[PDB]
Design a binder for this molecule. Structure first.
Ligand SMILES: [Br-]
Ligand SMILES: [Br-]
Ligand SMILES: [Fe+3]
Ligand SMILES: [Fe+3]
Ligand SMILES: [Fe+3]
Ligand SMILES: [Fe+3]
Lengths: 387, 166, 510, 511, 388
């Protein structure tokens, strides 16, 4: 019918009259701020904090917890739903962490959605504009299809490394940031395939199948050490913090930043490829976003913990050293790829310049935070010895 | 057939227009139509309800014929009558700038529209004309706009006062 | 040069190949099953398209809330009882959404096929959205409602009461502690498919009837995501249907999962609907039968038969204990009203007639008790009477099931009255049903949750309340109340003066 | 330094003024007596990207409310019948104003020479496109979800049947784009928006809420947030030309003409909107008008521009004196000509008459009795064979159309203005209702040649006009327009045809 | 108060009951589709169409209008509010046009807003990632600041060419498309300045002042004929269709596409510049979006008009010839820029090939549509004469 059969209390005269009659003269408490008891990181409580902080039902025996008592149901054996035993790191309050970008679900999917739609629009303009005409065939059919494509398995592997952390994270603020770090990773992997699917549509004989790039990743030599380090960070680490720290503050900050930025983002333009940089722009925008959250957690919170400052730095310095070697190896193997490039593409003077950028940026943003003493020259040297 | 959007007058004129197959004849007929049926100075108000629509149909015919008869340069710079469009624009603006009063100015502007409206004069020159002629006309008309009493304004305009109530 | 692009499905087509073989490529979580690494997923999504489809929904939702709904003063024109009910419904659901994040994160780790991992992953993100959505509901009612207390701090004030413990068993721990598959059954096969999915829609129905247009706006948006989760649960069974361990362990994990979930929701949901509202939509007994028995127990579970899934053996038992469950529980919830973070109301005349009409015998038991308590002044702070005193006077002990945490009173209940008490290595344990008893006997270390009487023993009531911040802004008036009127609110002093001290009910068997 | 950096709108806008450059033909293409200053600045430092973002945010909230909660509440239906009809006219007529304002500001953008002033008008160009689509959406929403889609669904063509539409085009279409760009800016911004639109928009949302309509408040309140920029454009138009000798000579005349033009139509039509188009009232038009036009605009707003030579319109007093009964006098005509509309009208009910008489002493003895007579004649009943027009014929009360404003008037029956001037010029008759419009015509004959409904419909039988211009419901028989707002006994084309009413040009009686 | 003072008819018991009582039992008409009378371009009527078509109150004497009679108020002199006299083109219906992307205001600002916020995110990521380090200094301070910067005035001029059209367009669908084509041009000009402003923030000594780019535009040689062409298209054209057609289907399609795509988008990468291409991507996306609308109006609706097809093509052929000469002059002067580049950046063959790409795309997308007989090698040789 026009009015419908269901009567709603907000508009139905009879029901609304009853509701109105039962209402108090004024609110029964003047404090209309949800999460008012949360300690603000900034000047005033943000929507991000109110809607996130303390959603996790931890009891006081998990630093920061506001609840009390044991869990209601545990694992066969006695392992707690969540517990201090799932990570070496210690703190005075696991809820201290704050994403500098203050991303809760809404803002997060809003930004990514904007990128998706602009991406579709970009591809539609690029194809209509015939920009593919100025791209080097060899760079396209060999380096983008095989080597860039192979890197999707690297980003995919880093994505998967987050699964356990998605389950073990000890606070809401940390779980949300973690999830978003991993989700951005699979997004990148998917954008790499997207580009290959795009090429297949506008370049007649281009094959989008992952057959080629996968074999390169699983059997190639260029990514051999890269794949080994990934397989380890993913399936050999059972500590959600070692996983997150080692991936974002060690491996991907070194190997990843070099491959994405110093190799494809730097050289693709020279082959008339503005297509790949379009997606790498997203991967880097994402990397820099995550970085702020990674820094706030492991440095601002743990590394500078009012009670476990020295302790955590020791563990992170330990971790930094533990995975810095597998990372150095990854870079070394990757150095072989240069020899495959056409003559005159680049010289050792350039690569050395890029390597120092990656390392100096690393020490500047990560290494010096936990007082890890790293030698830029020795590192660059050990890596540079792979050409 | 006495409709608003479709009627005998309109049909009849569509036929008269279908019979214009030469630019000079068609263009002359368009200009004659404008003298006869447009502006408050029209020779007659018999076509008041359909002249706007009919004029457009006549314009369509003149445009089509002009595009077929004129080379590219003349289509851009000559009126349908073979006159140099710029010369006509400049000459008319000169006459306008020398107009002694608002009464002379209105005759110039209105007459220019009746004679050269687009199918006749190229649009670019015509609207450049509207720009300049309209400026002076307003400048003369809007000066001391309310000084002349209605009693005397009716006389200047030359209307026949049929009925007054108050 | 025709305009070209690539969609989600075109990329997803190669997603299964994203994963590669290698030594330790296996789940890090203990499990008795093996999810086939060739398992597929129903929705061919990638991160970016997923983000867009959710962004669009957010747009509408937050649009209505910030604009038209706020201009209509929708946060206010809601029946007082429902304003209170949503403090519990939204916050309690919030924890279910939150733990579901970790749960699907664990299932993502369990799945070996890239597509199945992708399926769970979509849910990981959805549950994060639902966490923030339920949070937003309380946030909105706190900001624009008739009583922000509770809505503004449930995350800490919920720890005072006993009903929150039971919620954590079904929506927190049950979701993440145990075999990954057991968790999946608790969350998706049972929790979401049998309760959550239907529950959410019914809630919007009861909300609408009571003037609340905020919850429908948000909850109906949450509901649009559930089809993906149903699919994940279904695909979980398909993933392990071929592993021999399945024919041996599946139906048991399912039964335990079913009992676990229904144990809490059967009494608690009926309570929230019939007692947390003024205007009624439908009798819970009718709803329950349709939901659990027909739809799920029959139609839904039936479709999983070919995969060796059978209807829970504890189904008949659940139906038997269900009839009076919610009526029996509200007596306890109201008797312990000072331990809540919401205000309660006794049934008015119209409601009592409604209860009697739909539940013959209701008045002679519950009805008379409520009138007795009210005439005695349970709503008036000057009476010095809290219904719990009535339980003491009439020797009606209230126990907490060691497994489910659900409160029960065997001597007064019109429903189940079985009680089993055991001692083991110096500790007493109280059980309310044979299923939970078995669970404890076989898995003692999984259930050591301390109950409110054990933790609060010897403490004076007002002291527990004060310590856990069960107060309003004035620092004197209680958040919880035995009525929903704006006058004569109970204060901490009104409670202190009574000198009610907690006792461990089980020690009476010493 | 490798810190996160970006650039905002203000940072780019700092250099926008320098975007324009000099060249011989860099000048406006439109006729104008004024010279807009080359260094004029704009109030809001926007760039295209940021403009789009701030409007996008508004749309989200707006469309979110409409598609979700409001649809779930059946907000499209639960509105008073009279108001559902009123919104057919208010939203579509406003739509044309929004639309022509697009062309109007495109013309001002062309006129402005300073890049910043051009940019200011540009924002309005885009805003008026948004407003066009917003007003369109209101009719679109009510058609799709309301109690009577007819009219809401085809106003763009069914509005052409009636005489009230002609007047709307004068003030909100032609008045906005035909003439000196400055004269147009005064009709649109300094008068139209600043005096009538801005206040009107809010008032409509209040009258809408009162009648159960939450759709309009949702859209119109969003439109309102954009108006600040347009007020600034109107204000800057005056500033840009203030130091030009021409200003002292022409500004106040163009302003006075623009004021009379706008008020001539809105004074009677708006009061007709609020008082006769609604069940529940909010405020008497008489006081609403004095506060809007006299105090607010004619006093404060116009007063702030005194430093630029701007004076209070010389026709303000005549406007006030004529205002009192204007809307009451016009509704008599609109109702009498109900078959020519695209909306359903209702006679004032018992309760309403009390209000009218209470708020306008003498209302009952004049309008009240007339309406009572028409209802007794069966004006609401299809079988009666009666339409108020007949009453006008029988009592010899000719209805004329002002040649300039297009506003219908019946001097032999009005309680307000009863003036009538009839002139003959070069074979054509012309009828005026006031001394300001008469001067406009005498001085600018060629600007005002609009054919009126009697001239166009002359000799035509009523039902024929209605049928030719598609004034029918989907059943192809029942009229869109009705003399009552009830769901039963709706007049059909045949009911009108049987009346055999034929249009005649009232001016032909004069010799 | 908590409930407020104003009572609302939708929620106030007393008022709502009055409302509900007056309501009919069912809708008074079953046709609940606004714009049902509009002939759909596609299978079903779109929201874009319903909300747009016929908003313009044209009478029937302006092809396709549904109203009747003269305007109520015209210009001094008699010029109509809108009229056939404002353009040489003729058609059976000015309302036939449809933006293939179906953009009404909401979708339009939605997409631009997405681009704005993503642009900001990109810049913050670009700056924090220090990608500026690898950009050739000369390309940056000489070609981006001076020459890319000077191009902003070209786009700004093309934006302004649309002012008269915004006022004279003979239909709603054409006005809307026209307004959006122009708005995208001012946006591009502002993005060029935005980049310069961004560079001034992360590059010590970089001057965001427009003095240099403006001096290059107004007094340099590289853009001299380009500026003369823009000044003409904008201010010497009084026909709104000649303006939009000549701007989008002649000048910008040849000169604009060459500068944006074959010079800056093509060479910026070779100097480690991923910054300018980010903005040029937006400009090219906008160009390709407008092209669809431009083609629908001039080719699908006017060039293929059932009654005036021959006439309209003759006129557009005329306009193409009129504006092709100045456009060639513009490209020819621009060739002077290649001599400024560091040796080895590009050579005559690459330059020539890129010219043919622009000319070939133009023949295919525009010229061929009206049977304009363009001679690609004649056009290119005329342009190459400008190479120093
Ligand atoms: Br106690
Ligand atoms: Br008649
Ligand atoms: Fe959920
Ligand atoms: Fe779920
Ligand atoms: Fe507007
Ligand atoms: Fe406006």
């Amino acid at each position: 019918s026009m009015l419908g059969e269901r009567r709603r209390g907000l508009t139905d005269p009879e029901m609304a009259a009853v509701i109105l009659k039962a209402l108090p003269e004024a609110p029964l408490d003047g404090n209309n701020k949800m999460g008012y008891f949360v300690t603000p990181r900034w000047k005033r409580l943000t929507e991000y904090e109110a809607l996130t902080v303390y959603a996790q039902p931890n009891a006081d025996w998990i630093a920061g917890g506001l609840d009390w008592g044991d869990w209601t149901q545990k694992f066969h054996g006695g392992r707690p739903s969540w517990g201090n035993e799932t990570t070496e790191l210690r703190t005075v309050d696991w809820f201290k962490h704050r994403d500098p970008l203050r991303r809760w679900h809404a803002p997060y999917v809003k930004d990514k959605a904007e990128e998706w739609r602009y991406t579709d629009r970009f591809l539609q303009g690029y194809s209509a504009d015939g920009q593919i005409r100025a791209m080097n065939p060899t760079w396209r059919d060999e380096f983008i299809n095989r080597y860039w494509g192979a890197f999707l398995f690297n980003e995919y592997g880093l994505f998967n490394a987050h699964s356990q952390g998605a389950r073990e994270a000890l606070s809401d603020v940390t779980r949300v940031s973690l999830a978003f770090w991993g989700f951005d990773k699979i997004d990148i992997a998917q954008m790499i395939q997207l580009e290959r699917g795009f090429l297949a549509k506008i370049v007649p004989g281009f094959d989008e199948s992952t057959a080629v790039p996968k074999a390169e990743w699983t059997n190639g030599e260029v990514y051999k050490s890269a794949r080994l380090a990934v397989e380890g960070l993913w399936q050999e680490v059972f500590d959600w913090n070692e996983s997150a720290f080692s991936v974002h503050a060690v491996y991907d900050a070194l190997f990843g930043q070099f491959v994405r930025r110093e190799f494809f983002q730097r050289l693709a333009p020279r082959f008339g490829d503005n297509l790949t940089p379009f997606f790498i722009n997203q991967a880097q925008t994402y990397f820099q976003i995550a970085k702020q959250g990674v820094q706030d957690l492991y440095y601002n919170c743990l590394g500078d913990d009012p009670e476990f400052s020295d302790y955590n730095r020791t563990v992170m310095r330990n971790w930094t050293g533990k995975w810095l070697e597998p990372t150095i190896a990854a870079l070394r193997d990757f150095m072989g790829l240069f020899a495959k490039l056409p003559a005159g593409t680049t010289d050792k003077e350039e690569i050395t310049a890029s390597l120092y950028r990656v390392v100096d940026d690393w020490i500047e943003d990560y290494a010096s935070r936990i007082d890890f003493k790293a030698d830029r020259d020795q590192i660059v040297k050990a890596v540079l010895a792979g050409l | 057939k006495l409709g608003i959007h479709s009627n005998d007058t309109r049909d009849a004129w569509v036929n008269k227009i279908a019979q214009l197959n030469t630019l000079e004849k068609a263009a002359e007929m368009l200009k004659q139509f404008r003298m006869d049926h447009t502006t408050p100075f029209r020779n007659s108000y018999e076509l008041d309800n359909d002249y706007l629509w009919i004029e457009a149909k006549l314009e369509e015919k003149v445009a089509v014929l002009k595009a077929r008869a004129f080379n590219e340069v003349d289509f851009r710079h000559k009126t349908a009558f073979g006159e140099d469009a710029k010369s006509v624009l400049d000459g008319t603006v000169a006459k306008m700038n020398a107009a002694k009063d608002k009464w002379e100015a209105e005759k110039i502007h209105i007459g220019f529209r009746q004679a050269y409206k687009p199918p006749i004069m190229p649009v670019n020159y015509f609207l450049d004309g509207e720009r300049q002629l309209g400026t002076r006309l307003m400048e003369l008309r809007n000066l001391n706009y309310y000084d002349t009493p209605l009693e005397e304004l009716r006389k200047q305009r030359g209307v026949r006062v049929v009925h007054l109530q108050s | 040069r025709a305009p070209t692009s690539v969609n989600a499905q075109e990329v997803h087509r190669w997603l299964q190949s994203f994963n590669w073989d290698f030594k330790n490529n296996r789940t890090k979580y203990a499990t008795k099953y093996k999810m086939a690494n060739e398992t597929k997923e129903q929705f061919k999504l990638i991160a970016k398209e997923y983000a867009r489809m959710e962004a669009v929904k957010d747009e509408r939702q937050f649009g209505s809330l910030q604009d038209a709904l706020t201009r209509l003063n929708a946060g206010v024109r809601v029946h007082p009882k429902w304003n209170e009910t949503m403090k519990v419904v939204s916050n309690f659901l919030e924890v279910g959404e939150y733990n579901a994040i970790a749960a699907t994160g664990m299932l993502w780790d369990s799945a070996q096929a890239a597509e199945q991992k992708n399926g769970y992953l979509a849910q990981v993100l959805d549950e994060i959205r639902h966490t923030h959505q339920c949070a937003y509901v309380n946030y909105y009612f706190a900001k624009n409602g008739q009583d922000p207390a509770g809505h503004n701090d449930a995350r800490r004030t919920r720890t005072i009461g006993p009903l929150w413990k039971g919620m954590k068993r079904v929506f927190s721990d049950g979701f993440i502690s145990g075999d990954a598959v057991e968790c999946s059954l608790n969350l998706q096969l049972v929790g979401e498919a049998c309760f959550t999915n239907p529950l959410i829609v019914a809630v919007t129905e009861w909300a609408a009837a009571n003037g609340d247009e905020i919850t429908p706006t948000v909850f109906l948006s949450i509901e649009t995501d559930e089809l993906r989760h149903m699919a994940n649960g279904y695909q979980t069974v398909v993933s392990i249907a071929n592993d021999p361990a399945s024919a041996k362990y599946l139906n048991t994990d399912l039964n335990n999962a079913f009992w676990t979930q229904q144990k809490y929701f059967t009494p608690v949901l009926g309570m929230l609907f019939e007692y947390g509202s003024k205007f009624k939509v439908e009798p819970w007994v009718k709803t329950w039968d349709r939901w659990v028995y027909e739809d799920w127990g029959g139609i839904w579970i039936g479709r999983l038969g070919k995969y060796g899934v059978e209807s829970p053996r504890s189904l008949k038992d659940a139906k038997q204990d269900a009839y009076w469950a919610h009526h029996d529980l509200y007596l306890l919830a109201y008797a312990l009203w000072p331990t809540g973070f919401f205000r309660l109301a006794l049934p008015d005349q119209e409601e009592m007639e409604w209860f009697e009409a739909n539940y013959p015998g209701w008045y002679d038991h519950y009805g008379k008790i409520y009138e007795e308590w009210r005439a005695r002044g349970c709503e008036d702070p000057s009476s010095g009477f809290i219904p719990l005193m009535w339980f003491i006077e009439n020797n009606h002990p209230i126990y907490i099931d060691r497994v489910s945490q659900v409160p029960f009173c065997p001597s007064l209940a019109k429903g189940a009255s079985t009680l089993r008490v055991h001692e083991y290595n110096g500790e007493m344990h109280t059980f309310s049903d044979q299923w939970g008893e078995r669970m404890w006997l076989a898995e003692p270390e999984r259930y050591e949750c301390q109950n409110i009487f054990e933790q609060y023993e010897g403490r004076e009531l007002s002291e527990v309340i004060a310590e856990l911040h069960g107060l309003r802004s004035d620092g004197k008036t209680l958040i919880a109340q035995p009525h929903v009127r704006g006058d004569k609110l109970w204060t901490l002093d009104d409670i202190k003066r009574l000198n009610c001290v907690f006792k461990n009910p089980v020690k009476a068997f010493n």
